PDB file of C-alpha atoms (C1' of nucleotides) in Angstrom:
ATOM      1  CA  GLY O   1      -0.127  -0.198  -0.098  1.00 39.27           C
ATOM      2  CA  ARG O   2       0.848   4.015  -0.456  1.00 37.46           C
ATOM      3  CA  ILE O   3       2.459   6.158   1.885  1.00 35.83           C
ATOM      4  CA  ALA O   4       0.827   8.639   3.838  1.00 33.75           C
ATOM      5  CA  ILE O   5       1.253  12.747   4.629  1.00 35.21           C
ATOM      6  CA  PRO O   6       2.541  12.784   8.520  1.00 33.81           C
ATOM      7  CA  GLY O   7       3.120  17.051   7.729  1.00 34.86           C
ATOM      8  CA  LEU O   8      -1.365  16.197   7.867  1.00 32.18           C
ATOM      9  CA  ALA O   9      -1.598  17.054  11.523  1.00 34.43           C
ATOM     10  CA  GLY O  10       0.004  20.631  11.399  1.00 34.43           C
ATOM     11  CA  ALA O  11      -2.833  22.956  13.250  1.00 31.95           C
ATOM     12  CA  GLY O  12      -2.611  25.916  15.812  1.00 33.94           C
ATOM     13  CA  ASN O  13      -0.486  27.163  13.127  1.00 33.07           C
ATOM     14  CA  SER O  14      -0.576  30.559  14.020  1.00 32.53           C
ATOM     15  CA  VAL O  15      -0.006  31.602  10.545  1.00 31.98           C
ATOM     16  CA  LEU O  16      -3.080  32.267   8.098  1.00 32.96           C
ATOM     17  CA  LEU O  17      -4.067  31.113   4.643  1.00 29.19           C
ATOM     18  CA  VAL O  18      -5.322  34.429   3.504  1.00 31.29           C
ATOM     19  CA  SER O  19      -7.103  33.993   0.458  1.00 30.25           C
ATOM     20  CA  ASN O  20      -9.391  35.460  -2.334  1.00 29.03           C
ATOM     21  CA  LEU O  21      -8.372  39.358  -1.678  1.00 26.25           C
ATOM     22  CA  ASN O  22      -8.501  41.885  -4.329  1.00 25.31           C
ATOM     23  CA  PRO O  23      -4.250  42.787  -3.524  1.00 24.10           C
ATOM     24  CA  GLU O  24      -5.366  45.578  -6.716  1.00 24.51           C
ATOM     25  CA  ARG O  25      -7.485  47.367  -3.407  1.00 22.37           C
ATOM     26  CA  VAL O  26      -6.172  46.028   0.109  1.00 21.42           C
ATOM     27  CA  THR O  27      -2.986  47.072   0.770  1.00 23.92           C
ATOM     28  CA  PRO O  28      -0.190  45.441   3.623  1.00 27.67           C
ATOM     29  CA  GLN O  29      -1.295  48.573   5.738  1.00 27.18           C
ATOM     30  CA  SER O  30      -5.371  48.057   5.842  1.00 28.08           C
ATOM     31  CA  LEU O  31      -4.889  43.781   6.336  1.00 28.85           C
ATOM     32  CA  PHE O  32      -2.975  45.154   9.392  1.00 28.41           C
ATOM     33  CA  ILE O  33      -5.222  47.626  10.837  1.00 29.49           C
ATOM     34  CA  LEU O  34      -8.074  45.015  10.412  1.00 28.40           C
ATOM     35  CA  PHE O  35      -5.755  41.337  11.747  1.00 27.35           C
ATOM     36  CA  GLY O  36      -3.746  43.819  13.887  1.00 27.19           C
ATOM     37  CA  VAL O  37      -7.175  44.895  16.389  1.00 30.05           C
ATOM     38  CA  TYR O  38      -7.980  41.042  16.117  1.00 32.80           C
ATOM     39  CA  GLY O  39      -4.503  39.423  16.703  1.00 31.27           C
ATOM     40  CA  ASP O  40      -1.762  40.992  15.600  1.00 31.32           C
ATOM     41  CA  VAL O  41       0.249  40.341  11.855  1.00 32.39           C
ATOM     42  CA  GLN O  42       3.739  39.817  13.275  1.00 32.16           C
ATOM     43  CA  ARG O  43       4.492  39.598   9.465  1.00 31.09           C
ATOM     44  CA  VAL O  44       2.177  39.739   6.311  1.00 30.98           C
ATOM     45  CA  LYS O  45       3.669  37.832   3.173  1.00 29.77           C
ATOM     46  CA  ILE O  46       1.668  38.785  -0.116  1.00 24.15           C
ATOM     47  CA  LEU O  47       3.139  36.168  -3.161  1.00 25.54           C
ATOM     48  CA  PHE O  48       2.431  38.766  -6.177  1.00 27.36           C
ATOM     49  CA  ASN O  49       0.500  40.796  -7.717  1.00 23.75           C
ATOM     50  CA  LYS O  50      -1.960  38.571  -9.430  1.00 27.24           C
ATOM     51  CA  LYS O  51      -1.838  35.472  -7.245  1.00 30.13           C
ATOM     52  CA  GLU O  52      -4.511  37.302  -5.038  1.00 31.19           C
ATOM     53  CA  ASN O  53      -2.921  35.769  -1.924  1.00 27.69           C
ATOM     54  CA  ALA O  54      -1.279  35.886   1.166  1.00 28.85           C
ATOM     55  CA  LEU O  55      -0.050  34.183   3.974  1.00 29.68           C
ATOM     56  CA  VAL O  56      -0.116  35.858   7.504  1.00 28.19           C
ATOM     57  CA  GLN O  57       1.807  35.024  10.587  1.00 26.72           C
ATOM     58  CA  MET O  58      -0.107  36.114  13.848  1.00 27.03           C
ATOM     59  CA  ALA O  59       0.722  36.624  17.382  1.00 28.22           C
ATOM     60  CA  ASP O  60      -0.922  33.109  18.130  1.00 26.04           C
ATOM     61  CA  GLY O  61      -3.023  30.131  16.976  1.00 21.34           C
ATOM     62  CA  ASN O  62      -6.272  31.347  19.107  1.00 20.98           C
ATOM     63  CA  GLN O  63      -5.603  35.053  17.900  1.00 23.18           C
ATOM     64  CA  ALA O  64      -5.496  33.911  14.240  1.00 22.58           C
ATOM     65  CA  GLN O  65      -8.657  32.080  15.228  1.00 23.34           C
ATOM     66  CA  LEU O  66     -10.362  35.025  16.063  1.00 23.81           C
ATOM     67  CA  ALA O  67      -9.495  37.323  12.964  1.00 21.81           C
ATOM     68  CA  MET O  68     -10.631  34.018  10.863  1.00 23.36           C
ATOM     69  CA  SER O  69     -13.697  34.441  12.862  1.00 24.39           C
ATOM     70  CA  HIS O  70     -14.150  38.364  12.053  1.00 24.03           C
ATOM     71  CA  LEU O  71     -12.763  38.253   8.593  1.00 28.13           C
ATOM     72  CA  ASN O  72     -13.356  34.941   6.620  1.00 26.74           C
ATOM     73  CA  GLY O  73     -15.922  36.336   3.928  1.00 24.47           C
ATOM     74  CA  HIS O  74     -15.474  40.065   4.919  1.00 21.75           C
ATOM     75  CA  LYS O  75     -16.389  43.024   3.186  1.00 19.24           C
ATOM     76  CA  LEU O  76     -13.779  45.360   1.731  1.00 22.20           C
ATOM     77  CA  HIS O  77     -13.448  47.264  -1.370  1.00 24.37           C
ATOM     78  CA  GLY O  78     -14.786  44.882  -4.030  1.00 23.36           C
ATOM     79  CA  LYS O  79     -14.086  40.763  -3.380  1.00 21.27           C
ATOM     80  CA  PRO O  80     -14.680  38.823   0.073  1.00 21.69           C
ATOM     81  CA  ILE O  81     -11.992  37.789   1.796  1.00 17.41           C
ATOM     82  CA  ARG O  82     -11.279  34.068   2.456  1.00 17.21           C
ATOM     83  CA  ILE O  83      -8.926  32.329   5.297  1.00 17.97           C
ATOM     84  CA  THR O  84      -8.295  29.025   6.849  1.00 17.43           C
ATOM     85  CA  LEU O  85      -5.676  27.997   9.544  1.00 18.25           C
ATOM     86  CA  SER O  86      -2.729  27.198   6.970  1.00 17.13           C
ATOM     87  CA  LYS O  87       0.058  24.352   6.954  1.00 16.99           C
ATOM     88  CA  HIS O  88       2.695  26.926   7.619  1.00 17.74           C
ATOM     89  CA  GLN O  89       4.709  28.348  10.436  1.00 17.41           C
ATOM     90  CA  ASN O  90       7.403  31.534   9.786  1.00 16.93           C
ATOM     91  CA  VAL O  91       8.200  33.999   6.646  1.00 16.42           C
ATOM     92  CA  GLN O  92      11.612  33.929   5.760  1.00 15.52           C
ATOM     93  CA  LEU O  93      12.110  37.850   5.254  1.00 14.68           C
ATOM     94  CA  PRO O  94      13.772  38.550   1.953  1.00 15.67           C
ATOM     95  CA  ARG O  95      16.609  41.249   2.302  1.00 18.53           C
ATOM     96  CA  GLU O  96      17.367  44.121   4.518  1.00 19.35           C
ATOM     97  CA  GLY O  97      15.578  46.823   2.626  1.00 18.41           C
ATOM     98  CA  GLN O  98      14.538  44.932  -0.534  1.00 16.75           C
ATOM     99  CA  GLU O  99      11.064  43.537  -1.289  1.00 18.15           C
ATOM    100  CA  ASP O 100       9.937  43.127   2.287  1.00 20.13           C
ATOM    101  CA  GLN O 101       8.804  46.605   1.459  1.00 20.22           C
ATOM    102  CA  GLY O 102       5.416  45.455   0.464  1.00 17.09           C
ATOM    103  CA  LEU O 103       5.470  41.855  -0.399  1.00 13.78           C
ATOM    104  CA  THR O 104       6.480  40.509   2.882  1.00 15.92           C
ATOM    105  CA  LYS O 105       5.849  43.413   5.630  1.00 14.24           C
ATOM    106  CA  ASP O 106       7.896  43.013   8.929  1.00 14.32           C
ATOM    107  CA  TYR O 107       5.657  43.862  11.917  1.00 15.89           C
ATOM    108  CA  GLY O 108       7.647  42.033  14.686  1.00 17.79           C
ATOM    109  CA  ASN O 109       8.669  45.551  15.889  1.00 20.41           C
ATOM    110  CA  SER O 110       5.618  47.311  14.394  1.00 19.59           C
ATOM    111  CA  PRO O 111       5.438  51.031  14.715  1.00 20.42           C
ATOM    112  CA  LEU O 112       2.163  51.351  16.666  1.00 24.81           C
ATOM    113  CA  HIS O 113       0.490  48.180  17.221  1.00 25.62           C
ATOM    114  CA  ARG O 114       1.288  44.540  19.503  1.00 20.28           C
ATOM    115  CA  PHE O 115      -0.236  41.796  21.599  1.00 20.53           C
ATOM    116  CA  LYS O 116       0.505  39.651  24.114  1.00 20.65           C
ATOM    117  CA  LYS O 117      -0.857  36.314  25.390  1.00 20.18           C
ATOM    118  CA  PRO O 118      -4.676  36.353  26.780  1.00 21.42           C
ATOM    119  CA  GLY O 119      -6.072  37.557  29.973  1.00 21.08           C
ATOM    120  CA  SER O 120      -3.718  40.851  29.083  1.00 23.68           C
ATOM    121  CA  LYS O 121      -5.140  44.503  29.363  1.00 24.58           C
ATOM    122  CA  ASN O 122      -4.444  44.511  25.712  1.00 21.70           C
ATOM    123  CA  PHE O 123      -7.710  42.551  25.113  1.00 22.71           C
ATOM    124  CA  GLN O 124     -10.169  44.739  26.936  1.00 20.15           C
ATOM    125  CA  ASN O 125     -11.511  46.852  23.821  1.00 20.22           C
ATOM    126  CA  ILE O 126     -12.120  43.872  21.062  1.00 16.31           C
ATOM    127  CA  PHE O 127     -15.568  44.204  20.197  1.00 18.02           C
ATOM    128  CA  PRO O 128     -17.057  42.486  16.987  1.00 20.09           C
ATOM    129  CA  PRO O 129     -17.903  44.533  14.137  1.00 21.67           C
ATOM    130  CA  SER O 130     -21.253  46.986  14.823  1.00 20.34           C
ATOM    131  CA  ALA O 131     -22.848  50.282  13.881  1.00 20.43           C
ATOM    132  CA  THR O 132     -21.409  51.466  17.066  1.00 20.38           C
ATOM    133  CA  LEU O 133     -17.594  53.050  17.906  1.00 20.83           C
ATOM    134  CA  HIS O 134     -15.516  53.729  20.484  1.00 22.96           C
ATOM    135  CA  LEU O 135     -12.536  56.045  19.742  1.00 22.22           C
ATOM    136  CA  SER O 136      -9.494  57.268  21.558  1.00 23.26           C
ATOM    137  CA  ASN O 137      -6.020  58.836  21.507  1.00 22.78           C
ATOM    138  CA  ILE O 138      -7.887  61.924  19.753  1.00 25.74           C
ATOM    139  CA  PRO O 139      -5.427  64.982  20.117  1.00 27.18           C
ATOM    140  CA  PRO O 140      -6.994  68.757  21.291  1.00 25.88           C
ATOM    141  CA  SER O 141      -5.703  69.718  17.738  1.00 28.49           C
ATOM    142  CA  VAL O 142      -9.769  68.152  16.545  1.00 27.08           C
ATOM    143  CA  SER O 143     -13.175  68.806  17.598  1.00 25.74           C
ATOM    144  CA  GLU O 144     -16.486  67.527  17.608  1.00 24.37           C
ATOM    145  CA  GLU O 145     -16.544  69.563  14.113  1.00 20.64           C
ATOM    146  CA  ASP O 146     -13.420  67.711  12.218  1.00 19.81           C
ATOM    147  CA  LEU O 147     -13.799  64.113  13.081  1.00 13.91           C
ATOM    148  CA  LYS O 148     -17.695  64.456  11.612  1.00 12.39           C
ATOM    149  CA  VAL O 149     -15.781  64.855   8.475  1.00 11.41           C
ATOM    150  CA  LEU O 150     -13.677  62.033   9.293  1.00  9.37           C
ATOM    151  CA  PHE O 151     -16.215  59.579   9.565  1.00 10.00           C
ATOM    152  CA  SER O 152     -18.882  61.713   6.774  1.00 10.43           C
ATOM    153  CA  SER O 153     -15.657  60.911   4.362  1.00 12.09           C
ATOM    154  CA  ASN O 154     -16.558  56.969   4.097  1.00 11.92           C
ATOM    155  CA  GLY O 155     -20.228  57.986   2.791  1.00 12.92           C
ATOM    156  CA  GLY O 156     -20.894  58.531   5.631  1.00 10.97           C
ATOM    157  CA  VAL O 157     -24.248  58.537   7.480  1.00 13.23           C
ATOM    158  CA  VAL O 158     -22.885  59.782  11.046  1.00 13.39           C
ATOM    159  CA  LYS O 159     -25.767  58.261  13.230  1.00 16.00           C
ATOM    160  CA  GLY O 160     -23.982  59.547  16.715  1.00 14.15           C
ATOM    161  CA  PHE O 161     -21.560  61.308  18.384  1.00  9.82           C
ATOM    162  CA  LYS O 162     -20.768  61.822  22.436  1.00  9.54           C
ATOM    163  CA  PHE O 163     -17.334  63.488  23.367  1.00  8.16           C
ATOM    164  CA  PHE O 164     -15.711  62.084  26.922  1.00 10.87           C
ATOM    165  CA  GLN O 165     -15.570  65.292  28.946  1.00  6.21           C
ATOM    166  CA  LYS O 166     -14.964  62.533  31.781  1.00  7.83           C
ATOM    167  CA  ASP O 167     -11.263  61.197  30.404  1.00  4.42           C
ATOM    168  CA  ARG O 168     -10.445  63.622  27.520  1.00  4.35           C
ATOM    169  CA  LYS O 169      -8.626  61.165  25.054  1.00  4.88           C
ATOM    170  CA  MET O 170     -11.947  59.862  23.970  1.00  2.00           C
ATOM    171  CA  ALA O 171     -15.486  60.095  22.019  1.00  2.00           C
ATOM    172  CA  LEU O 172     -18.188  57.829  21.441  1.00  2.00           C
ATOM    173  CA  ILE O 173     -19.508  57.540  17.731  1.00  2.10           C
ATOM    174  CA  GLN O 174     -22.707  55.367  15.674  1.00  5.02           C
ATOM    175  CA  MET O 175     -22.725  55.391  11.855  1.00  6.05           C
ATOM    176  CA  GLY O 176     -25.909  54.395   9.835  1.00  4.38           C
ATOM    177  CA  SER O 177     -24.531  50.618   8.716  1.00  7.94           C
ATOM    178  CA  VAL O 178     -21.895  47.585  10.265  1.00  7.00           C
ATOM    179  CA  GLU O 179     -20.376  48.171   6.799  1.00  6.75           C
ATOM    180  CA  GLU O 180     -19.272  52.176   7.010  1.00  4.03           C
ATOM    181  CA  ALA O 181     -18.585  51.504  10.735  1.00  5.03           C
ATOM    182  CA  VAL O 182     -15.920  49.041   9.618  1.00  3.50           C
ATOM    183  CA  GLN O 183     -14.801  51.188   6.550  1.00  2.00           C
ATOM    184  CA  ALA O 184     -14.073  53.484   8.892  1.00  2.00           C
ATOM    185  CA  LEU O 185     -11.754  51.478  11.541  1.00  2.00           C
ATOM    186  CA  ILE O 186      -9.716  50.808   7.689  1.00  2.00           C
ATOM    187  CA  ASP O 187      -9.509  54.412   6.995  1.00  2.00           C
ATOM    188  CA  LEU O 188      -8.980  56.494  10.394  1.00  2.73           C
ATOM    189  CA  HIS O 189      -7.369  54.309  12.802  1.00  2.00           C
ATOM    190  CA  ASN O 190      -3.536  55.287  12.357  1.00  2.00           C
ATOM    191  CA  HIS O 191      -5.033  58.767  10.552  1.00  2.00           C
ATOM    192  CA  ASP O 192      -1.951  60.784  11.630  1.00  2.00           C
ATOM    193  CA  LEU O 193      -2.104  64.556  12.778  1.00  2.00           C
ATOM    194  CA  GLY O 194       1.299  63.949  14.016  1.00  2.00           C
ATOM    195  CA  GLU O 195       3.882  61.194  15.349  1.00  2.00           C
ATOM    196  CA  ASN O 196       1.882  60.033  18.715  1.00  3.25           C
ATOM    197  CA  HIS O 197      -1.304  62.045  17.591  1.00  2.70           C
ATOM    198  CA  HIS O 198      -3.173  60.017  15.498  1.00  2.88           C
ATOM    199  CA  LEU O 199      -6.632  58.202  15.484  1.00  6.90           C
ATOM    200  CA  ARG O 200      -7.964  54.975  17.066  1.00  4.71           C
ATOM    201  CA  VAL O 201     -10.794  53.234  16.968  1.00  3.40           C
ATOM    202  CA  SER O 202     -12.436  50.018  18.289  1.00  8.62           C
ATOM    203  CA  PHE O 203     -16.372  48.784  17.859  1.00 10.10           C
ATOM    204  CA  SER O 204     -18.371  49.659  21.332  1.00  5.86           C
ATOM    205  CA  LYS O 205     -19.395  48.009  24.095  1.00  6.32           C
ATOM    206  CA  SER O 206     -21.916  50.161  24.571  1.00  5.75           C
ATOM    207  CA  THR O 207     -24.626  52.848  23.068  1.00  6.69           C
ATOM    208  CA  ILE O 208     -25.077  56.446  22.996  1.00  5.30           C
TER     209      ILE O 208
ATOM    210  C1'   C I   1       5.538  63.441  25.104  1.00  2.15           C
ATOM    211  C1'   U I   2       1.010  55.729  24.262  1.00  2.00           C
ATOM    212  C1'   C I   3      -2.457  52.640  23.565  1.00  2.00           C
ATOM    213  C1'   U I   4      -9.602  52.017  24.199  1.00  2.00           C
ATOM    214  C1'   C I   5     -16.080  52.803  26.520  1.00  3.27           C
ATOM    215  C1'   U I   6     -19.839  56.966  29.035  1.00  2.00           C
TER     216        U I   6
ATOM    217  C1'   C J   1     -10.308  28.906  -7.808  1.00  2.00           C
ATOM    218  C1'   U J   2      -6.362  27.137  -1.073  1.00  2.00           C
ATOM    219  C1'   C J   3      -0.181  29.219   1.459  1.00  2.69           C
ATOM    220  C1'   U J   4       7.296  31.499   1.587  1.00  3.79           C
ATOM    221  C1'   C J   5       7.603  34.903  -6.421  1.00  2.00           C
ATOM    222  C1'   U J   6      13.990  36.769  -2.201  1.00  2.00           C
TER     223        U J   6
END
RNA sequence: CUCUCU
RNA sequence: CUCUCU
């Protein structure tokens, strides 16, 4: 009789097979915002411009499971994303400053995101995609009237909005749909006014 | 000059 | 049509 495949037992891999995307319209940064709220990309391999495919490396297999749970089938920019638990474990990283520039993005020392093992404070603000938003790291350099233009730029129905007088880094906001709220996260998370002064974006725990 | 719930 | 194109 023929031989078997001993590598077929390869589960809990911490990588994701990320497939069926439109690489014409979704960047390593858009991926990084999404997968990095859910579970923290250490790397983003993209194969080439018409493979329609990527091979993501996340912090842990349970965090990869949660990212998959929110992103397998996701509606962004055109095509529905496809995902599975992969078969790999690491990516090689090409060179010191070549092709890692967009096709093997090193987030192992990210400029602005990280996670740890479960039970850390890092997990406290992960919420499922909802029409209601919770917004943070907001500088004195903007007001209510500016933040309306940010979320209106999405197209764009701002339902609701209350600034946080109690703790002035923050606001609560709401949109007319979940897809508006999702694309407002994809847009405005890390919209930079300065070196630490940028928008930070989650879905809400609670209502306005 | 760093993280996120009213 | 589902994975390392340096």
